[PDB]
From Swiss-Prot, chain A:
This is Small ribosomal subunit protein bS20. One of its GO terms (cellular component) is small ribosomal subunit. It comes from the Bacteria. Residues 1-25 are annotated as: Disordered. Binds directly to 16S ribosomal RNA. Keywords: Ribonucleoprotein, Ribosomal protein, RNA-binding, rRNA-binding. InterPro entries: Ribosomal_bS20, Ribosomal_bS20_sf. The keyword Ribonucleoprotein applies. The keyword Cell cycle does not apply. GO terms for molecular function: ornithine decarboxylase inhibitor activity; small ribosomal subunit rRNA binding; structural constituent of ribosome. SUPFAM superfamilies: Ribosomal protein S20. Part of the 30S ribosomal subunit. The lineage of its organism: Bacteria, Pseudomonadati, Pseudomonadota, Gammaproteobacteria, Enterobacterales. Belongs to the bacterial ribosomal protein bS20 family.
Swiss-Prot record, chain B:
It comes from Escherichia coli (strain K12). Keywords: Antibiotic resistance, Ribonucleoprotein, Ribosomal protein, RNA-binding, rRNA-binding. This is Small ribosomal subunit protein uS17. The keyword Cell membrane does not apply. Belongs to the universal ribosomal protein uS17 family. NCBIfam families: PRK05610.1, uS17_bact.
From Swiss-Prot, chain C:
It comes from Escherichia coli (strain K12). The lineage of its organism: Bacteria, Pseudomonadati, Pseudomonadota, Gammaproteobacteria, Enterobacterales. Part of the 30S ribosomal subunit. Contacts protein S5. With proteins S3 and S5 encircles the mRNA as it enters the ribosome, which may play a role in mRNA helicase processivity. Some nascent polypeptide chains are able to cross-link to this protein in situ. The rRNA transcription and antitermination complex (rrnTAC) consists of RNAP, NusA, NusB, NusE (rpsJ), NusG, SubB, ribosomal protein S4, DNA and precursor rRNA; S4 is more flexible than other subunits. Coiled coil: none annotated. Disulfide bonds: none annotated. GO terms for cellular component: cytoplasm; cytosol; cytosolic small ribosomal subunit; small ribosomal subunit. Residues 95-155 form the S4 RNA-binding domain. One of two assembly initiator proteins for the 30S subunit, it binds directly to 16S rRNA where it nucleates assembly of the body of the 30S subunit. With S5 and S12 plays an important role in translational accuracy; many suppressors of streptomycin-dependent mutants of protein S12 are found in this protein, some but not all of which decrease translational accuracy (ram, ribosomal ambiguity mutations). Changing Y50D: In rpsD101; suppresses a temperature-sensitive mutant of release factor 1, R137P. Not a ram mutation. This is Small ribosomal subunit protein uS4.
From Swiss-Prot, chain D:
This is Small ribosomal subunit protein bS16. Part of the 30S ribosomal subunit. One of its GO terms (biological process) is ribosomal small subunit assembly. InterPro entries: Ribosomal_bS16, Ribosomal_bS16_CS, Ribosomal_bS16_dom_sf. In addition to being a ribosomal protein, S16 also has a cation-dependent endonuclease activity. GO terms for molecular function: DNA endonuclease activity; four-way junction DNA binding; structural constituent of ribosome. NCBIfam families: S16. It comes from Escherichia coli (strain K12).
Length: 85, 80, 205, 81
RNA sequence: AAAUUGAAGAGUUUGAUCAUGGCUCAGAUUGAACGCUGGCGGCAGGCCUAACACAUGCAAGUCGAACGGUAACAGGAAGAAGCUUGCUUCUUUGCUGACGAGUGGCGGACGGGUGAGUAAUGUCUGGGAAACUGCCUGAUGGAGGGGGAUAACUACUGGAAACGGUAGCUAAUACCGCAUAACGUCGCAAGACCAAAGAGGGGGACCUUCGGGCCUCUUGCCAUCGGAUGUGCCCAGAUGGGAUUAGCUAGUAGGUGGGGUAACGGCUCACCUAGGCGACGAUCCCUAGCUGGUCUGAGAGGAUGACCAGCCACACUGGAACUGAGACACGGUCCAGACUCCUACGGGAGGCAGCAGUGGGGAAUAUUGCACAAUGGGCGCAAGCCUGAUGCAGCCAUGCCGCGUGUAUGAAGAAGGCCUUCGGGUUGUAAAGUACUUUCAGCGGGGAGGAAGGGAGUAAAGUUAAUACCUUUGCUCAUUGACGUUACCCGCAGAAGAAGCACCGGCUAACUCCGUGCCAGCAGCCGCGGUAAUACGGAGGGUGCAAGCGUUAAUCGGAAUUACUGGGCGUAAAGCGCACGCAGGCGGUUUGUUAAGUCAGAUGUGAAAUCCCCGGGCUCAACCUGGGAACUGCAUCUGAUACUGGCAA
């Protein structure tokens, strides 16, 4: 790093990396909850996990960590898998 | 008024798909002679309504697989 | 560049007069025009088709003062222009500023006209020209400048021009030291001793 | 930003600008979309130094193409006639 | 109207001739190199080899109109000032102009360089759908109320350094909830859910806790639908050589169902089919960035892709990922390896295939120059800052173009040299002499243009309660050029400071003499030289070019000597030893129909630049530039049906 702008962006891309990783893990936790409740055979716990997960995913998409096209795919796939029970 | 191509069918062993041996009449750039440079493709065959040695008409659609980019619209001259 | 060597030598080599001198005296009275220069003169050279084409091209080059690099460009321009390539080359050569000055009579020799143009004693349409190869356009006016309008050489040039034949395509007013280029010269208005067909065949070899 | 600017050409000490519409990312004398008029700052009299296409420039200014200071000055000058 | 107008051969096989056939040459070019010489100017060009290794200086910074803060500086309200009774001290004081450092927004993925790799994941042409898109712009709306902490800072402390660690406080357009939910997401629907940030300027009192409330203007923020631009993906054709590379492929071809990307897709996974490519060249090997274009060639063609422009790949080597709208990122971050550097020996730093510049390689390619004064780019409301992009300067005859190194007279045909038959001739109007001119270079002086804008004001309109602030329109004022001692113009004196190279037997234009003797030597081919050499070396003379002239390397032409245009196979080289025959190539005659090839028109595109035509401007030209033609092509549509082909009789 020979530029002060590069030195500053080096830690700007690390603090942001930590925050984005934390938020991504938080969202993937609820995604895993929904996916684990789907195959168990229940239709109420999976639906409750879907309602717990959807606002978080929508908020992350609005903030820009993920894309609304990915959020829609996740929601549609989870709803399609739930509706088959 | 949709761009389509017509050609024979060579293979139907693949599941829900066929191949088309498109034939044309191309003039040689140097010697000025007309030749027949064929072109092979992979065409989606939903319902398997085709056969070997049959004439088919195809249409360019979204890529269904790695080698698929065309789909058929009808079948004509179902010769056996 | 320019040729600074003898001129009667080139005239003898070409076998005819090339009008590189003032013309006060004759050619025989100044040199031996019938004898080629060098120890091996006094015998008529026996040349081939390539030799005669080269001599025909060199005669024009030495008459007009042009070199090979500037004459090949003129030939290319003549070939590019529509019509007779040989006539267009002659018209372009006659359109040179020094040639126009020589024809009008403001210079006794074409070399003198070139020197005047270089030394900036000639203006075209009120604007001075410092190039001896300026291409003259129809309806142009070439006049002598006031700083050099009182030259004994510049008046003896007119005194010799009046003795010489007058150009039809030009006009001149000796009192005002001015001339007008009316039209582009034609083939009939030039000399008949130049076979221009020997230059096209030489350059297309 | 898609912009309208002046790409420079010609010999040294005798420049000649062409008013072209191009992306600001691209280079000056590099890539462009449309060429609209020219400009010769050293042009003499009885010789046009501006042949801008006002209709075409407006077609891009209505889509979002911004105008540089020199382009705006040339537009004002050509409108002052 | 014009956009083209375009074709040379010669020498050598043989006692001699014809034919076939091989070799060489005259020609045009280069990012060229070497020898000799060397006046100037203008526009262009300048590591083709070691993608070899780099010392040194710059190349990406900006914003106080985002927020805490004043480490420097100047302007201070106040007071501690030596007192001179105003001031050349100096604590304190961020209140002011501004600002080191830091948080934060933006920019870093553009601009610039290289062509190692890639023969196809690349490039060109023409079609598309299954996608995204900051800054730009149009429309519809919203923009409510809260919080916990981190820097900078303080104290301590580790380490040689680089670089950190601990305890504590504070700010926002940083962060997170949270409030609402639409033409947004999900789904058949019902219904569920996701957003914000404020900042600056000026004012009348209704208010003020005296900071500001409240009004207006500007700017800024969030959601959606759009537009333009840019980016990603797919198909068809075209884009090198080798068959002494004939068999390749098991995530391989496809399908079903999950997962995944902004998006389709074996992109990935689990299972099921045994398929898929290939003689129209799969696979493998070697070389190579591609195109617009350039050279040659009249033309089809051949060679090539330097400088200008577009596309792709890369940044010491091999891989990786994050932030980010947009990189798997030249001057961003990890890790491994080689090469250097610092070291207190525990440990750390670096990547010129950026602009100059160093060493080495090679035949060889330049100055650690000035400037942001223009056009752009980044930041900023703007002023303004940075910019080795760019505009310019320096070197090089490397290429193109232009000018000059004087013009006229001047026979006693001066002198001298050379030749000679000894009469003479050549150098030779050439020199000298005589009158004149002074372009270029030098001296002096004058002097455009590249400059449009910006700032300070003023008047009007818009604007609002508002003659306030702000935008626009005009007008006035002092200005903003590295080039630059500019281009350009006028006087000074004086021909003064300015011509060389190659060749002279034929091809090919240009001959005599002297030294030599198959010795020295020339050479592109025929060849020359063995005592009169126009061929070796020198002199005189002559020829061709010209500040260039010769030599060498490469391409094309001539080479109709790879012949599609444009050739041959009885005897020069060329008919398989002969038959059958698959694929393939071609195909008798009539009608009807389809209209694929073909033929006509139209539309879109075929970037710009380049070639050409008609013009225009640098004192002409080179050079630049306006318009047009052209880019022979491709896709679609409208038709024609004579021929080939598809179908029927
Ligand atoms: Mg580091
Ligand atoms: Mg020259
Ligand atoms: Mg013989
Ligand atoms: Mg021959
Ligand atoms: Mg360095
Ligand atoms: Mg600061
Ligand atoms: Mg290249
Ligand atoms: Mg925010
Ligand atoms: Mg909410
Ligand atoms: Mg809020
Ligand atoms: Mg599998
Ligand atoms: Mg799926
Ligand atoms: Mg799938
Ligand atoms: Mg390569
Ligand atoms: Mg030919
Ligand atoms: Mg090529
Ligand atoms: Mg390197
Ligand atoms: Mg790497
Ligand atoms: Mg991201
Ligand atoms: Mg890359
Ligand atoms: Mg970078
Ligand atoms: Mg990198
Ligand atoms: Mg670097
Ligand atoms: Mg360099
Ligand atoms: Mg060196
Ligand atoms: Mg060396
Ligand atoms: Mg600038
Ligand atoms: Mg700097
Ligand atoms: Mg004598
Ligand atoms: Mg001068
Ligand atoms: Mg000026
Ligand atoms: Mg001869
Ligand atoms: Mg010789
Ligand atoms: Mg002898
Ligand atoms: Mg000799
Ligand atoms: Mg001599
Ligand atoms: Mg040929
Ligand atoms: Mg033959
Ligand atoms: Mg024989
Ligand atoms: Mg034979
Ligand atoms: Mg036989
Ligand atoms: Mg027939
Ligand atoms: Mg047809
Ligand atoms: Mg047509
Ligand atoms: Mg002109
Ligand atoms: Mg074009
Ligand atoms: Mg028929
Ligand atoms: Mg047939």
């Amino acid at each position: 790093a020979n530029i002060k702008s590069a030195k500053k962006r080096a830690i700007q891309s690390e603090k942001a990396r930590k925050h984005n990783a934390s938020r991504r893990s938080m969202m993937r936790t609820f995604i895993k909850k929904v996916y684990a409740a789907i195959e168990a055979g229940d239709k109420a716990a999976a639906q409750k996990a879907f309602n717990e997960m959807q606002p978080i995913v929508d908020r992350q998409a609005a903030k820009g960590l993920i894309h609304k096209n990915k959020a829609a795919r996740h929601k549609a796939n989870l709803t399609a898998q739930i509706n088959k029970l | 008024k949709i761009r389509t191509l017509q050609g024979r069918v060579v293979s139907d062993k693949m599941e829900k798909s066929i191949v088309v041996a498109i034939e044309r009449f191309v003039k040689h750039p140097i010697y000025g002679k007309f030749i027949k440079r064929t072109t092979k493709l992979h065409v989606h065959d939903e319902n398997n309504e085709c056969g070997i040695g049959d004439v088919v008409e195809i249409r360019e659609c979204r890529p269904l697989s790695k080698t698929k980019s065309w789909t058929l619209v009808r079948v004509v001259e179902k010769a056996v | 560049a320019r040729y600074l060597g003898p001129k009667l030598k080139l005239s003898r080599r070409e076998g005819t007069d090339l009008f590189l001198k003032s013309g006060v005296r004759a050619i025989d009275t100044k040199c031996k025009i019938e004898q080629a220069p060098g120890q091996h003169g006094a015998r008529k050279p026996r040349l081939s088709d390539y030799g005669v084409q080269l001599r025909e091209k060199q005669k024009v080059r030495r008459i007009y003062g042009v070199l090979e690099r500037q004459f090949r460009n003129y030939y290319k321009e003549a070939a590019r222009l529509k019509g007779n390539t040989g006539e267009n080359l002659l018209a372009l050569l006659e359109g040179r500023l020094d040639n126009v000055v020589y024809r009008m009579g403001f210079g006794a020799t074409r070399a003198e006209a070139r020197q005047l143009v270089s030394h900036k004693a000639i203006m075209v349409n009120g604007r001075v020209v410092n190039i001896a190869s300026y291409q003259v356009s129809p309806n142009d006016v070439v006049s002598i400048r006031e700083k050099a309008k009182k030259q004994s050489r510049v008046k003896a040039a007119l005194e010799l021009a009046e003795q010489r034949e007058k150009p039809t395509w030009l006009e001149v007013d000796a009192g005002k030291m001015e001339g007008t280029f009316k039209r582009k010269p034609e083939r009939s208005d030039l000399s008949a001793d130049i076979n221009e067909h020997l230059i096209v065949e030489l350059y297309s070899k | 930003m898609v912009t309208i600017r002046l790409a420079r050409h010609g010999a040294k000490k005798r420049p000649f600008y062409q008013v072209v519409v191009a992306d600001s990312r691209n280079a000056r004398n590099g890539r462009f979309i449309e060429r609209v008029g020219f400009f010769n700052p050293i042009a003499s009299e009885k010789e046009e130094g501006t042949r801008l296409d006002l209709d075409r420039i407006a077609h891009w200014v209505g889509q979002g193409a911004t105008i540089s200071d020199r382009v705006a000055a040339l537009i004002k000058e050509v409108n002052k006639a």
